[PDB]
Design a protein around this ligand. Structure first.
Ligand code: MG
Ligand code: MG
Ligand code: MG
Ligand code: MG
Ligand code: MG
Ligand code: MG
Ligand code: MG
Length: 169
RNA sequence: UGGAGAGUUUGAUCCUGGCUCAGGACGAACGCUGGCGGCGUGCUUAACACAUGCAAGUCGAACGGAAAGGUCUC
């Protein structure tokens, strides 16, 4: 009942005297589907072994993703090694819109409503690194208010204010 | 109230970087196919030459006149 999703399976090789020694890298994203997402690279001689290593080290690389009920709090732009991923919160109707590498990471994080765009490198691993960086950049109204010293109502816009309680009644 | 990516340089990698593809549109054309209706639409090239027909006519309450019809007649 806890979601895994592998994005890229890539066969690496190391060269020796005899010939080429092959290995597999298994970038996977593990997510609960509500707010918990982790990314694991994972490497092994065998494709399922790399899958498993990636899952196991993704589940120890967790971080909370601040949402407001299906979309992110505010728009960001994560910058990876060379990956650039732009995230814009979406109206509560239009669903996830994202590229192949990003889509898995935000679906595992559990967002239902997001605009994602890969502008930098097209490598999947650096794309997910950029998206993760953007989710780190994400901030919550209730801790931005503590950061700034002012209450909730005079830091967060009235739209997201009234859009919060519509989830939990 | 709104933004998706994939393949391809290497033994393998990450960038840079082009090329290609997945979508949509036409006053369209060609291949195959094909029932109808509604509503739109049809020389994008030779402002190249045109047979043939119509597309600018009207008033007898403006006038001199009687070519035709019907009349008063012989
Ligand atoms: Mg840069
Ligand atoms: Mg690029
Ligand atoms: Mg080269
Ligand atoms: Mg090759
Ligand atoms: Mg490219
Ligand atoms: Mg036919
Ligand atoms: Mg009709």
């Amino acid at each position: 009942n806890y979601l895994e999703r592998v994005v890229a399976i890539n066969r690496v090789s190391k060269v020796v005297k005899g010939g080429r020694r092959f290995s597999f890298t298994a970038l996977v994203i593990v997510g609960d589907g509500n707010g918990m997402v982790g990314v694991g690279y994972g490497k092994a001689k065998e494709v399922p072994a790399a899958i498993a290593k990636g899952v196991e080290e993704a589940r120890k690389s967790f971080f909370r993703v601040p949402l407001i009920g299906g979309t992110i709090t505010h728009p960001v732009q994560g910058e990876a090694a060379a990956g650039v991923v732009l995230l814009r919160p979406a109206s509560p109707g239009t669903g996830v819109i994202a590229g192949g590498a990003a889509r898995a990471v935000l679906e595992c994080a559990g967002v239902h409503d997001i605009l994602a765009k890969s502008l930098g490198s097209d490598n999947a691993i650096n794309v997910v690194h950029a998206t993760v960086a953007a989710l780190k950049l994400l901030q919550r109204p209730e801790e931005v208010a503590a950061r700034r010293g002012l209450p909730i109502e005079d830091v967060a816009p009235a739209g997201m204010l009234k859009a919060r309680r519509k989830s939990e009644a």
